[PDB]
């Protein structure tokens, strides 16, 4: 409920204690799934830069003066969207569940991106770096890891977040 | 519906177990246990980037290099 | 001595091998070959950092920190 | 001496300089290991902002106080002069490595830097670690050896250059530490 008015009330939702004990048993492997969450929120600026600057590597016209990510307001609103996307799928991780993303994010998303005309394609290839990027951060192993969490498999909820990219690059391409 | 306002969660996970800066911030009391030292935090905060940061990434980017992680992928 | 301007050299390489984009910038002899399509940028840069990228790091500080 | 870029170097102007063709030809000879020191100096600048962000979140991982009410990064304000300043050291780093000289990093970076920290408070143990972590970073990014289908680079041995580098940032160590 918190999350929920937060994502209808305008303050923070601050969960700790016994209210996180609480939350602990209404999601699914809470302790990992906290892990995988702060996994990819924590690393949430390198994931987004590797993702634009991928899909511009990969088509540099992106950033000639025709492309879409031309100008640093363009570029901005880019790599603003990007951060946004993200964030959507780790609220989504974080909650296990769709319901936010599909109604908050995605539902009217493309004829937005249609009427803009902000290319698909493009805009697929920064969602699928950053799916691979946050299956690496959930799994720990991406070349940056964290040192000590106790070992286990963590491959459901990095199928989960997969999932959650998907529904991303189902809703825009 | 997306409603183009640019909000976002924003979420801030602390496991601060053993950290000495003592927790102020929840307000349902105590689990009597580690949880005590440990918060998730959710905000709905506008997500806002600055022309002179995307001028800062643009000089980054359009050199065609990469991070450790990936195959590099660019033909140019 | 440091001058405290916050001010530093900011070099781009552009190395742009193959790149349909015709060079322009650089106005020197030519070399004849795969120089022509490469280039070193220098400028003096008063270096900036904004509230938003600070508060990113913040952010990330306090979720990476334990103890 | 770069002489194309002697007046971006002392700050006389804020006009770009540009070493391209025949000028860049001839660079390349007048520094050693051309092609490879170009490709360094690239892979290093073109990842600036993540090399000093891990850097100073790393620095305040390993000591929270330093965002505590106290601390030397505390308020936006702090933080943003403290990222600032691990950019100004890994650009003046990045010339040194550019020209093969580290005279420029010393003369116009770290001359009077120390002095500087010392007026302000800016903690010397906590800044050593932000520079040791941006060292580490730049020399992984020069001697990677990850296969070739990961590299921006046709693979070979940049061990010496990471080595340079590395003498570099120690430079910066010594003077501020
Ligand atoms: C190929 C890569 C590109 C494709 C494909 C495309 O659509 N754009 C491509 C490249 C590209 N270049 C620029 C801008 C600049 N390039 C240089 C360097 C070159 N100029 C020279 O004189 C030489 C060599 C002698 C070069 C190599 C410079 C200095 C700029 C200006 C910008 C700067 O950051 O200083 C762009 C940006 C848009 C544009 O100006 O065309 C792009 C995308
Ligand atoms: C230990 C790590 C720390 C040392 C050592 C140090 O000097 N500072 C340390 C931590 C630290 N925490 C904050 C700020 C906040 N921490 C939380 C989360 C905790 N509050 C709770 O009630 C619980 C559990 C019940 C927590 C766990 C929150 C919400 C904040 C406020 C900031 C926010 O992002 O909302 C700081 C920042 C400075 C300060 O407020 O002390 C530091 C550095
Ligand atoms: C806090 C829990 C904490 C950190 C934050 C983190 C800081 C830290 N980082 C390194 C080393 C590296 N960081 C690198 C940075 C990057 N690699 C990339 O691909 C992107 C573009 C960029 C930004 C994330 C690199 C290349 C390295 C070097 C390789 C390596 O992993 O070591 C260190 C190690 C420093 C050292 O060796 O002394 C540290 C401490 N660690 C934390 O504990
Ligand atoms: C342009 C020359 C260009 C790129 C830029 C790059 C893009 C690219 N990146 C990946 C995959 C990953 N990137 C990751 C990012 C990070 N890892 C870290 O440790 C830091 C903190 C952060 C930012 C650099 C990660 C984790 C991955 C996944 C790695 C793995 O699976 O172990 C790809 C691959 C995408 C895909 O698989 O579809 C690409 C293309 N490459 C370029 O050429
Ligand atoms: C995939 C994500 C990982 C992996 C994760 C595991 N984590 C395990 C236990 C665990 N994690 C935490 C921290 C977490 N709980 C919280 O409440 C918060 C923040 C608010 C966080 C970040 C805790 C407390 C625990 C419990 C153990 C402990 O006391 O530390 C864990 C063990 C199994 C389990 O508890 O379900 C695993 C497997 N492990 C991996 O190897 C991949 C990479
Ligand atoms: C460590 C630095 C790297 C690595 C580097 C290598 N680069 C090699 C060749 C090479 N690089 C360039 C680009 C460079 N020259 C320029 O003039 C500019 C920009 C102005 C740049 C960025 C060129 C032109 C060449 C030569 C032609 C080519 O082979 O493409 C190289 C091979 C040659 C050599 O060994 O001297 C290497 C090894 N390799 C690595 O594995 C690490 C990561
Ligand atoms: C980056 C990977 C893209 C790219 C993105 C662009 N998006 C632009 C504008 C824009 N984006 C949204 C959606 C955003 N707002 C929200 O409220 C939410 C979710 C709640 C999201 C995801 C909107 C509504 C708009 C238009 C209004 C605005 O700018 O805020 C945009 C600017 C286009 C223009 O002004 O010309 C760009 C460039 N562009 C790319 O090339 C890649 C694929
Ligand atoms: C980050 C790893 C540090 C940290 C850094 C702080 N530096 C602050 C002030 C400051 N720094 C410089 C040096 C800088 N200016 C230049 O012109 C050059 C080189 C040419 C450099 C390297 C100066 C001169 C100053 C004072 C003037 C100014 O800020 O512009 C500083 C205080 C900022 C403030 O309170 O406004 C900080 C926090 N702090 C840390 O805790 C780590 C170790
Ligand atoms: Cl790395
Ligand atoms: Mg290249
Ligand atoms: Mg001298």
Do not use: W
Not at chain 1, 37 to 53: F, P, R, T, Y
Not at chain 1, 86 to 107: I, M, Q, T, W
Not at chain 1, 123 to 151: D, G, W, Y
Not at chain 3, 10 to 19: A, E, K, L, N, P
């Amino acid at each position: 409920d918190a999350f929920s008015r937060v994502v209808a009330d305008s303050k923070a939702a601050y969960v700790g204690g016994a209210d996180l004990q609480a939350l602990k048993k209404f999601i699914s492997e809470g302790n990992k799934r906290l892990d995988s969450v702060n996994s990819i929120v924590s690393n949430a600026s390198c994931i987004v830069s590797d993702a634009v600057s991928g899909m511009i590597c990969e088509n540099p016209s992106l950033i000639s003066p025709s492309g879409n990510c031309y100008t640093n307001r363009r570029m901005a609103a880019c790599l603003r969207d990007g951060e946004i996307i993200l964030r959507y799928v780790s609220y989504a991780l974080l909650s296990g569940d769709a319901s936010v993303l599909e109604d908050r994010c995605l539902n009217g998303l493309k004829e937005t991106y249609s009427s803009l005309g902000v290319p698909a394609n493009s805009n697929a290839r920064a969602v699928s770096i950053m799916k691979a990027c946050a299956v690496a951060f959930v799994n720990n192993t991406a070349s940056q890891k964290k040192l000590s969490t106790p070992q286990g498999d963590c491959s459901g909820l990095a199928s989960e977040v997969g999932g959650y990219f998907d529904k991303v690059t189902a809703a825009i391409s | 519906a997306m409603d183009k306002s640019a909000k976002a969660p924003q979420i801030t996970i602390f496991d601060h177990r053993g950290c000495s800066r003592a927790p102020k911030e929840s307000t349902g009391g105590k689990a009597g246990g580690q949880d005590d030292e440990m918060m998730v935090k959710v905000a709905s905060t506008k997500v806002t980037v600055s022309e002179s940061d995307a001028a800062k990434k643009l000089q980054e980017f359009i050199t065609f290099e990469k991070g450790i992680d990936g195959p590099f992928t660019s033909k140019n | 001595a440091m001058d405290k301007s916050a001010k530093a050299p900011v070099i781009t390489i552009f190395d742009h091998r193959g790149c349909s984009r015709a060079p322009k910038e650089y106005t020197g002899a030519k070399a004849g070959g795969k120089d022509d399509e490469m280039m070193v940028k220098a400028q003096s840069v008063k270096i900036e950092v904004s509230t938003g990228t600070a508060e990113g790091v913040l952010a990330t500080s306090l979720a990476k920190m334990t103890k």
